[PDB]
Amino acid sequence: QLHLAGFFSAGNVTHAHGAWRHVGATNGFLTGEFYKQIARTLERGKFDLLFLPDGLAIEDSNLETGVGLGGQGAVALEPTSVIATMAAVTQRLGLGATVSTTYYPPYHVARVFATLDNLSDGRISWNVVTSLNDSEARNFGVDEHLEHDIRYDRADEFLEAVKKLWSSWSEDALLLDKVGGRFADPKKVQYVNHRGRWLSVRGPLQVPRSRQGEPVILQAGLSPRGRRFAGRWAEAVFSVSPNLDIMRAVYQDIKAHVAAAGRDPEQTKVFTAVMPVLGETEQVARERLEYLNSLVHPEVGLSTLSSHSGLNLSKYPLDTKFSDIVADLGDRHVPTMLQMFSAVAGGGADLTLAELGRRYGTNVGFVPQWAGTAEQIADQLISHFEAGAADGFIISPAYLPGIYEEFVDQVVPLLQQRGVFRTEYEGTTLREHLGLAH
Amino acid sequence: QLHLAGFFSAGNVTHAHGAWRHVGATNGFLTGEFYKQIARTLERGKFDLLFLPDGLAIENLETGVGLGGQGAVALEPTSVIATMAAVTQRLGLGATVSTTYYPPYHVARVFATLDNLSDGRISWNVVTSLNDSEARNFGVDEHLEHDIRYDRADEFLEAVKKLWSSWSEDALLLDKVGGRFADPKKVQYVNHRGRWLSVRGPLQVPRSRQGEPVILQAGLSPRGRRFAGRWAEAVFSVSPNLDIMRAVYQDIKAHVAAAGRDPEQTKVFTAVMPVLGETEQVARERLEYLNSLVHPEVGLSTLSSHSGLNLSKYPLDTKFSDIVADLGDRHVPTMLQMFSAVAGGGADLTLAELGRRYGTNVGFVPQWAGTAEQIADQLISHFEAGAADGFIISPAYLPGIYEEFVDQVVPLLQQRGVFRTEYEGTTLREHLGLAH
Amino acid sequence: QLHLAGFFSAGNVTHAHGAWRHVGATNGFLTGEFYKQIARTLERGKFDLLFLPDGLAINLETGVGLGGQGAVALEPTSVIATMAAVTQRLGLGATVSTTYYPPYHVARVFATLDNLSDGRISWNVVTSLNDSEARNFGVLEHDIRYDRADEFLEAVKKLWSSWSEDALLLDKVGGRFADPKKVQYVNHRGRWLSVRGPLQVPRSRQGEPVILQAGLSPRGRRFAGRWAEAVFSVSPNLDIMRAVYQDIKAHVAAAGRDPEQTKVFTAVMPVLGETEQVARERLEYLNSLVHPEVGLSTLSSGRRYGTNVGFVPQWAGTAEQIADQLISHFEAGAADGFIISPAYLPGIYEEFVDQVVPLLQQRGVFRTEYEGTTLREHLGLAH
Amino acid sequence: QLHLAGFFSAGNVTHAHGAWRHVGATNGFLTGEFYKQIARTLERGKFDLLFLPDGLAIEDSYGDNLETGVGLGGQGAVALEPTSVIATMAAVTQRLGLGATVSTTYYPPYHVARVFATLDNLSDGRISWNVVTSLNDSEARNFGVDEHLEHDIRYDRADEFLEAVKKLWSSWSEDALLLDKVGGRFADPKKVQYVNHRGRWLSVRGPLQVPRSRQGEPVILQAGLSPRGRRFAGRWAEAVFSVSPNLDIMRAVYQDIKAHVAAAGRDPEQTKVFTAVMPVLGETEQVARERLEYLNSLVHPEVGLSTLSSHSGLNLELGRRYGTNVGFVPQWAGTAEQIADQLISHFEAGAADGFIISPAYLPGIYEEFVDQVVPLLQQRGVFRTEYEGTTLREHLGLAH
């Protein structure tokens, strides 16, 4: 019976790089009302989960492009407080935030999330990132650098250290015996004394366990070391794949990685992203999808493409065809995700830089756009789920808050009527909704 | 016209160490409903603000966990704030974030974030302290020297202020048709590079309608008052009578003036712990009850902490003069000598009782038992005698006493014209009569 | 395991006739914020039920001048809707009069509120006729009004059954909005009343609203016997509580109905204090505010009448003690639950919920959490 | 500066008869959340007003049975009592004006005076009452009224009704309530007067049990339409809900209502005329056009004929088109740019003081309207950005 999650940047773009220009986009990303509407709506639709990405710098891989146009991370509210905002005016919905292990210490993370877990009565989850981008570092004044795979080694200790902090109290530690004078059993709140290879945390956490026990672990995963890590730690996995073939592979692989780590593969829920665009008739929808992708300024997509590929494409003029870039530099010395994308996005065509950017801003090259009816969006979700594509689906928003209104009003009751999706919330915590253990 | 502010730890105790034991104490400090209630009530009561302190370690743990210890539970205040802001439209909100365990980018962003999510009602209380147990939680061990932590904070504040000016009024154009998201000319890098700190990129959050979050400052130390002088826009103080309130008050204003700033733009608050009854006699019985709940050891735990001296070394019997024997009268802290003198009236108190009394207020928070008329009278007399620009209603027990205070006291202050009826404006700067 | 109920006039007094004067009385009775607060607080304390009484009329020297009964009174149905909108479990009840409003009116309003509250509503049936109200609505014997109300209840109930579960379909594809064989004309035509067309409102998840009843007169308790699923009562001590209880129970059996399917509440008026003396000193404060004439306005339609309403027990205590007496009276068969008459508003319920409720829950005699989502489930009633 | 109102039946249909079938129709009309969203959303768009109509019986005028009305989405098939819904909406909003239809034929003046004074107080000055005087048989059989008064006489009786209502709303007077807790005076008894109304059609004695809101009196709304109706609107209506298919008829009706308000010794600008339009939005012109087609394809012929039967007063593809709008509600398919344009060009040519937005489907269309159209009206300066005042009188440019 299928999970659903939302996901969007607390700011100007998620995957659709024209979203902000959309006639129906509010741009209320500065305002609490915007986040409260979205979340309440996903709660209305009985979604498992809504979670926020994070980036700690305006992307400059100058400011002409990122700020002037609507570039990735140009506005980025701190996710945790927005998650808190959301949790206040909702009672079942799962809520998740990205917090980095490279820039934040384990005690902070341990507390931040145990607070939100308690404030929300067990509905919280942390998305563990480990990236050490430069543009982010220069905002945090961090220069120390550790190698990609070592960051995940560190992160393993990080998570062990946090888990200890979430175990520092224990079910039944907090008595509130006013009469007898006992605030809590001191035997049952132990020091952690985490002293290990990368991190020190001594004193116990100052937040007991929510009804949920611990926050739910989210992991992007993706890299080879990354999938060992998800394998060990992830309970829900956020994955972006452009078709059912790649979906199926990523799915089986995560499951293998969870099982190789000595875990139950059913206890780690894998989500793939899609970007639905609804119409009353299929034709409407297609026209609505054309509208949407037409808003993407070429330079902004290119900006993001540049960043993602790790190769400044501003260097070149916008008419430059792609093979002439693969010419100017080495056909070896040209990153592989990039050559892949440009074959796929053009289907064999030798696109100009602007076109390539235009299309990359559409999704982020790899998020399926599904233009359809509601019946058809439900069909496709059920087919993919029944085909082994994922345990649930992240719903990327074309524009906010409207598309989430559309999807919850239109597609959700169809999913419910067919029996493949939750009609009422059976439990109260996020761990119950994803069907996980303690 | 006088300002009113709430203040309580997002956890088990604030100043009144019996608060958790109290019969009307909900102890919903783990829950959103609790903080949503309290913040809504102070909004009903037309308060200027409600700010939270923060402490980053439970203060062995036998006493702290066992009884109502300082820090024992402390939710991270940013989230708790965010929560209150979501069900609230006028009430200003504040969080303590430390400059010592968090870089400038983090702080400038959270607060620009809450400041935007609350539509201009947020404030940052700047702490510079380095407690041992907190460092043991964040894996720091090397410690900067007290006066230097302020010289650092001076840089930190310069850089956080730069971040919040990185955007600028009316740079975010949302010109969908023309496809201009913002003015890249009107968004500049900071490229801060001073002695202890680097922060570059523009902050990824524009200014709220407020402009910048409002600066809070707890002041105390001689260096701190030079710092409060430069930076503080509101000041939180704890003086136990009118002479010290006056003294602290003019002192702060003199530091603000000395810094080339306007003293009228720095509101000074002093904390008072009103207890209410329908008669003065009932007030007194209700104050007696509350202070009756303080376990001596808990109070002592907190006093040990605040004095900068571990008092578990001596048994509970030990009278104070024998401690001032065991250690020299020059090798004993002078907050503790002033406390035992004031709290015992010259009596040579057992260490238990000495703690019991410290855990009642935190030694220095006026307890005022009164009727509602008397509380409004004491508030008004104090305000008119120059004690403070406003008051920190320190809560005896939660959430009850704020319900009592807003229903009973506020409207009286309102009928005398010494307090707002309706919030005139919408930002926390407007409520405090501050600029930009 | 014992039920709890709120009760207060949507206006200036309920039973403490000096309540408006109290230092803590907010006098929010005009404002939406007032009622939303109380309702939410009563839900916080896991109360079964909050309900409003009503009267349709207030020379005015005594009434308006000082704090009289009905001096101000907002129309209950709209206040109840205000409460339902910012709550989700707590049951809500209003008084509507069978003598000035037609069957269709009542049936549809309580069905609307039932549907709006997702099945939490209750109607308190009143058949009484007062001169001041008659002259306000432009207008029979006592016992005959109840013979009329018997017909009224049949008509309301038929109307509520006019739709039937799963009649509504919303088959957008097929274009069938509802099953017209499953929505039916009532065609009521009894001795006093005519009401025909189907009710324009289907049944809530509760099925029907919960019926309350005041009881009182010999013929009144026979009415409760037939119709009442919940029975507000006032008795000044346990002996009379005991007597009323069994009398009601016996009438219900006498009507051929399951006695424990009808829930008996007794009004008590707690005043809380942190110690027994504070409790008592607070009680002295409350009754000091009572004007002698004001009690006499209500008593006619003397000073100590308007302290309680002569008969509502004032229990001053410490929370332990209010918990003790709540339990002791329950265990001695006084009532299945307790109407908490409020000293002053909204203050007292903040006290009762914060202080007494936890203790009732610890000894394990009152719900910690709502097991069900309907008022029917909370009271352990059927369909 | 131009006004805007929401309008929909607290049930299954308003003007668009295929609405319940629409793919994005929540059909949450039984549930609290549905109304609370709509209110809050129209509040988000800075709307003057949302008001509910009311029908006191299922429409069984067509085919003599429930068959069509219940089996398809017939006029009034479900209809919640609107005074409750208004209070539900008011509980979670603070500026948005709220109006309920209540009937002078089946309810006494004391009832009406008090409910609306109660909602006025609870909403803190945002309430209005839409006065109706109809006397249908299906409604009478639900209420047991065998009696009948002729059309125009019903309005003569309505005149008294409103004289009596207003007396009751004057029964309390500002600063008569004084909660002098110390003194012991709950209210100045000399400033709460009896009404002692004893006219031709009605009696109502006592004072109203509910004082005046900050607003004073609820705003009086009114449908008008008939010769004697238009005179009544003239004397009493502070707002007027109208339905007109083209610009000529809009102005003509507009100028006419003004003349009646003038003819009754009143300021014509103190009565705001609103005309109904039914926008359908698209990101493109083509999309809007498609969306309007979809919508209107859902209208099942019989349900259109049924409401035509009712509206005309005669039992019975002609019905398909009538169910589209209600024959005469203009449907505008456009782009938001274009819808905002039409709103302005009509406003500027004196077609109306404000616009009723009739909802294609709920709650989604108002979500679209508010997100898309409102800001453009705002950005052009023809519509509220903030609420300048906090009462429905203030938003509408009205007095005491």
mmCIF file of C-alpha atoms in Angstrom, chain C residues 12 20-27 29-33 35-36 54-61 63-68 70-79 81-87 100-105 108-109 112-113 115-118 131-132 135-139 159 163 168 170-181 183-185 194-203 289 291, chain D residues 12 20-27 29-33 35-36 54-58 60 64-74 76-85 87-93 106-108 110-111 114-115 118-119 121-123 138 140-144 168 172 177-189 192-194 203-212 298 300:
data_model
loop_
_atom_site.group_PDB
_atom_site.id
_atom_site.type_symbol
_atom_site.label_atom_id
_atom_site.label_comp_id
_atom_site.label_asym_id
_atom_site.label_seq_id
_atom_site.Cartn_x
_atom_site.Cartn_y
_atom_site.Cartn_z
ATOM 1 C CA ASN C 12 -22.562 36.814 31.761
ATOM 2 C CA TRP C 20 -18.719 38.737 36.180
ATOM 3 C CA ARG C 21 -17.316 40.872 39.001
ATOM 4 C CA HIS C 22 -14.480 38.391 39.873
ATOM 5 C CA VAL C 23 -10.954 39.803 39.351
ATOM 6 C CA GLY C 24 -10.092 37.040 36.866
ATOM 7 C CA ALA C 25 -13.352 36.971 34.930
ATOM 8 C CA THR C 26 -12.423 38.090 31.439
ATOM 9 C CA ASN C 27 -16.008 38.893 30.468
ATOM 10 C CA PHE C 29 -18.821 36.499 26.432
ATOM 11 C CA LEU C 30 -19.218 38.787 23.373
ATOM 12 C CA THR C 31 -16.005 37.576 21.684
ATOM 13 C CA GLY C 32 -15.257 34.482 19.593
ATOM 14 C CA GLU C 33 -11.842 34.211 21.292
ATOM 15 C CA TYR C 35 -15.433 30.418 23.584
ATOM 16 C CA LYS C 36 -12.662 29.002 21.390
ATOM 17 C CA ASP C 54 -30.384 29.171 26.546
ATOM 18 C CA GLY C 55 -33.349 31.411 27.234
ATOM 19 C CA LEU C 56 -35.022 33.715 24.712
ATOM 20 C CA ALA C 57 -35.596 36.772 26.978
ATOM 21 C CA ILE C 58 -33.635 38.680 29.632
ATOM 22 C CA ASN C 59 -38.606 45.954 34.395
ATOM 23 C CA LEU C 60 -34.872 45.488 33.623
ATOM 24 C CA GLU C 61 -33.670 47.260 36.795
ATOM 25 C CA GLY C 63 -31.418 42.050 35.362
ATOM 26 C CA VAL C 64 -29.506 44.497 33.169
ATOM 27 C CA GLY C 65 -28.412 46.741 36.058
ATOM 28 C CA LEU C 66 -26.502 44.102 38.002
ATOM 29 C CA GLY C 67 -25.358 40.601 36.807
ATOM 30 C CA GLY C 68 -28.693 38.847 36.074
ATOM 31 C CA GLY C 70 -29.911 35.932 30.618
ATOM 32 C CA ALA C 71 -28.813 39.594 30.919
ATOM 33 C CA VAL C 72 -26.723 38.853 27.892
ATOM 34 C CA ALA C 73 -27.107 35.612 25.979
ATOM 35 C CA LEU C 74 -25.707 34.872 22.545
ATOM 36 C CA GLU C 75 -27.600 32.403 20.406
ATOM 37 C CA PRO C 76 -26.125 28.980 21.341
ATOM 38 C CA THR C 77 -26.068 27.215 17.956
ATOM 39 C CA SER C 78 -23.593 29.829 16.591
ATOM 40 C CA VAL C 79 -21.348 29.713 19.644
ATOM 41 C CA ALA C 81 -20.302 26.145 15.772
ATOM 42 C CA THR C 82 -17.472 28.511 16.790
ATOM 43 C CA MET C 83 -16.211 25.917 19.282
ATOM 44 C CA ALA C 84 -16.571 22.999 16.845
ATOM 45 C CA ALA C 85 -14.373 24.746 14.270
ATOM 46 C CA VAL C 86 -11.250 24.862 16.517
ATOM 47 C CA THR C 87 -11.805 21.491 18.172
ATOM 48 C CA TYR C 100 -40.758 28.555 19.412
ATOM 49 C CA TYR C 101 -38.902 26.594 16.608
ATOM 50 C CA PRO C 102 -40.279 24.029 14.168
ATOM 51 C CA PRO C 103 -39.153 20.374 13.842
ATOM 52 C CA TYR C 104 -37.411 20.966 10.502
ATOM 53 C CA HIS C 105 -35.475 23.904 11.900
ATOM 54 C CA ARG C 108 -31.428 20.550 10.098
ATOM 55 C CA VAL C 109 -29.440 22.831 12.415
ATOM 56 C CA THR C 112 -25.570 20.617 10.075
ATOM 57 C CA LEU C 113 -23.623 21.022 13.314
ATOM 58 C CA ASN C 115 -21.823 17.073 10.041
ATOM 59 C CA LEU C 116 -19.663 20.215 10.631
ATOM 60 C CA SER C 117 -18.284 18.744 13.863
ATOM 61 C CA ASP C 118 -17.682 15.290 12.270
ATOM 62 C CA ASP C 131 -43.914 35.176 29.431
ATOM 63 C CA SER C 132 -40.897 37.387 28.567
ATOM 64 C CA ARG C 135 -43.634 38.478 24.022
ATOM 65 C CA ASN C 136 -40.271 38.311 22.118
ATOM 66 C CA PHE C 137 -41.500 35.568 19.686
ATOM 67 C CA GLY C 138 -44.887 37.318 19.187
ATOM 68 C CA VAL C 139 -47.072 34.563 20.750
ATOM 69 C CA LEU C 159 -35.929 13.727 9.377
ATOM 70 C CA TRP C 163 -31.117 10.092 4.401
ATOM 71 C CA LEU C 168 -24.769 9.790 -0.778
ATOM 72 C CA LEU C 170 -20.549 11.083 -5.525
ATOM 73 C CA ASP C 171 -20.007 8.920 -8.610
ATOM 74 C CA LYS C 172 -18.599 11.684 -10.782
ATOM 75 C CA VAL C 173 -17.898 9.235 -13.621
ATOM 76 C CA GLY C 174 -21.405 7.700 -13.567
ATOM 77 C CA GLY C 175 -23.109 11.012 -12.739
ATOM 78 C CA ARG C 176 -25.018 9.598 -9.775
ATOM 79 C CA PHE C 177 -24.868 12.140 -6.911
ATOM 80 C CA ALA C 178 -27.060 10.048 -4.549
ATOM 81 C CA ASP C 179 -29.295 6.958 -4.513
ATOM 82 C CA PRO C 180 -32.834 8.394 -4.802
ATOM 83 C CA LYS C 181 -34.316 5.106 -3.507
ATOM 84 C CA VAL C 183 -33.292 9.348 0.326
ATOM 85 C CA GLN C 184 -36.986 9.451 1.445
ATOM 86 C CA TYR C 185 -39.838 11.939 2.077
ATOM 87 C CA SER C 194 -46.546 18.840 9.829
ATOM 88 C CA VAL C 195 -43.176 18.429 8.164
ATOM 89 C CA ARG C 196 -42.714 16.765 4.804
ATOM 90 C CA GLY C 197 -39.738 16.875 2.488
ATOM 91 C CA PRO C 198 -36.586 14.976 3.175
ATOM 92 C CA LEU C 199 -34.168 16.773 5.440
ATOM 93 C CA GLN C 200 -31.539 18.538 3.336
ATOM 94 C CA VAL C 201 -28.686 17.109 5.436
ATOM 95 C CA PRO C 202 -27.410 13.526 5.612
ATOM 96 C CA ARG C 203 -26.374 11.662 8.760
ATOM 97 C CA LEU C 289 -19.508 39.438 45.004
ATOM 98 C CA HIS C 291 -25.666 40.853 45.117
ATOM 99 C CA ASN D 12 -23.846 20.588 -3.733
ATOM 100 C CA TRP D 20 -19.750 18.266 -8.064
ATOM 101 C CA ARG D 21 -18.640 15.982 -10.868
ATOM 102 C CA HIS D 22 -15.518 18.153 -11.671
ATOM 103 C CA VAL D 23 -12.341 16.121 -11.165
ATOM 104 C CA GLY D 24 -10.917 18.570 -8.575
ATOM 105 C CA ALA D 25 -14.151 19.072 -6.691
ATOM 106 C CA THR D 26 -13.511 18.069 -3.082
ATOM 107 C CA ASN D 27 -17.222 17.731 -2.333
ATOM 108 C CA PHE D 29 -19.572 20.451 1.786
ATOM 109 C CA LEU D 30 -20.487 18.299 4.769
ATOM 110 C CA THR D 31 -17.187 18.980 6.512
ATOM 111 C CA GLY D 32 -15.918 21.904 8.588
ATOM 112 C CA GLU D 33 -12.493 21.950 6.895
ATOM 113 C CA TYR D 35 -15.658 25.933 4.668
ATOM 114 C CA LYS D 36 -12.685 26.984 6.821
ATOM 115 C CA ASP D 54 -30.165 29.201 1.437
ATOM 116 C CA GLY D 55 -32.955 26.935 0.180
ATOM 117 C CA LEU D 56 -35.215 25.322 2.788
ATOM 118 C CA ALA D 57 -36.246 22.276 0.689
ATOM 119 C CA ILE D 58 -34.946 19.846 -1.949
ATOM 120 C CA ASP D 60 -38.840 18.528 -6.452
ATOM 121 C CA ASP D 64 -42.793 15.933 -9.093
ATOM 122 C CA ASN D 65 -40.182 13.805 -7.216
ATOM 123 C CA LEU D 66 -36.724 13.585 -5.602
ATOM 124 C CA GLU D 67 -35.585 11.316 -8.510
ATOM 125 C CA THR D 68 -33.701 14.009 -10.494
ATOM 126 C CA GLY D 69 -32.852 16.415 -7.673
ATOM 127 C CA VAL D 70 -31.297 13.789 -5.393
ATOM 128 C CA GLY D 71 -30.093 11.341 -8.039
ATOM 129 C CA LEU D 72 -28.260 13.991 -9.974
ATOM 130 C CA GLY D 73 -26.792 17.106 -8.324
ATOM 131 C CA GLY D 74 -30.018 19.006 -8.052
ATOM 132 C CA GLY D 76 -30.590 22.262 -2.846
ATOM 133 C CA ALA D 77 -30.151 18.444 -2.686
ATOM 134 C CA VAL D 78 -27.981 18.968 0.373
ATOM 135 C CA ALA D 79 -27.995 22.374 2.030
ATOM 136 C CA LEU D 80 -26.486 23.004 5.451
ATOM 137 C CA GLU D 81 -28.054 25.664 7.671
ATOM 138 C CA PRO D 82 -25.790 28.685 6.828
ATOM 139 C CA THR D 83 -25.772 30.608 10.112
ATOM 140 C CA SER D 84 -23.667 27.686 11.526
ATOM 141 C CA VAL D 85 -21.279 27.612 8.612
ATOM 142 C CA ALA D 87 -19.779 30.971 12.516
ATOM 143 C CA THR D 88 -17.425 28.133 11.568
ATOM 144 C CA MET D 89 -15.839 30.386 8.933
ATOM 145 C CA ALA D 90 -15.714 33.368 11.350
ATOM 146 C CA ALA D 91 -13.894 31.295 14.021
ATOM 147 C CA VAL D 92 -10.769 30.979 11.863
ATOM 148 C CA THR D 93 -10.739 34.383 10.170
ATOM 149 C CA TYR D 106 -40.346 31.303 8.279
ATOM 150 C CA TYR D 107 -38.452 33.162 11.078
ATOM 151 C CA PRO D 108 -39.527 35.915 13.556
ATOM 152 C CA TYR D 110 -36.321 38.421 17.419
ATOM 153 C CA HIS D 111 -34.694 35.207 16.130
ATOM 154 C CA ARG D 114 -30.315 37.977 17.741
ATOM 155 C CA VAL D 115 -28.534 35.388 15.544
ATOM 156 C CA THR D 118 -24.523 37.112 17.916
ATOM 157 C CA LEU D 119 -22.522 36.463 14.686
ATOM 158 C CA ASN D 121 -20.271 40.014 17.966
ATOM 159 C CA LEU D 122 -18.442 36.684 17.481
ATOM 160 C CA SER D 123 -16.921 37.795 14.164
ATOM 161 C CA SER D 138 -41.696 22.698 -0.896
ATOM 162 C CA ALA D 140 -43.659 25.700 3.437
ATOM 163 C CA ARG D 141 -44.356 21.918 3.700
ATOM 164 C CA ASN D 142 -41.059 21.483 5.620
ATOM 165 C CA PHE D 143 -42.016 24.368 7.961
ATOM 166 C CA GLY D 144 -45.765 23.496 8.163
ATOM 167 C CA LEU D 168 -33.783 45.521 18.448
ATOM 168 C CA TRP D 172 -28.540 48.261 23.671
ATOM 169 C CA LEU D 177 -22.594 47.783 28.995
ATOM 170 C CA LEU D 178 -20.062 48.770 31.641
ATOM 171 C CA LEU D 179 -18.464 46.022 33.584
ATOM 172 C CA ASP D 180 -17.804 48.000 36.751
ATOM 173 C CA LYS D 181 -16.715 44.976 38.800
ATOM 174 C CA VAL D 182 -15.819 47.213 41.767
ATOM 175 C CA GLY D 183 -19.031 49.314 41.703
ATOM 176 C CA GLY D 184 -21.377 46.371 41.049
ATOM 177 C CA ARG D 185 -23.069 47.875 37.974
ATOM 178 C CA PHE D 186 -23.115 45.322 35.118
ATOM 179 C CA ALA D 187 -24.854 47.762 32.762
ATOM 180 C CA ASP D 188 -26.553 51.212 32.785
ATOM 181 C CA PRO D 189 -30.223 50.044 32.927
ATOM 182 C CA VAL D 192 -31.033 49.189 27.633
ATOM 183 C CA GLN D 193 -34.606 50.081 26.498
ATOM 184 C CA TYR D 194 -37.499 47.712 25.746
ATOM 185 C CA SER D 203 -45.004 41.732 17.942
ATOM 186 C CA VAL D 204 -41.648 41.741 19.682
ATOM 187 C CA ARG D 205 -41.335 43.095 23.220
ATOM 188 C CA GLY D 206 -38.193 42.530 25.189
ATOM 189 C CA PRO D 207 -34.805 44.020 24.544
ATOM 190 C CA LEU D 208 -32.407 42.034 22.391
ATOM 191 C CA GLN D 209 -30.158 39.794 24.547
ATOM 192 C CA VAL D 210 -27.021 40.834 22.533
ATOM 193 C CA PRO D 211 -25.407 44.288 22.270
ATOM 194 C CA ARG D 212 -24.026 46.051 19.204
ATOM 195 C CA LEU D 298 -20.313 17.819 -16.940
ATOM 196 C CA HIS D 300 -26.271 16.669 -17.213
#
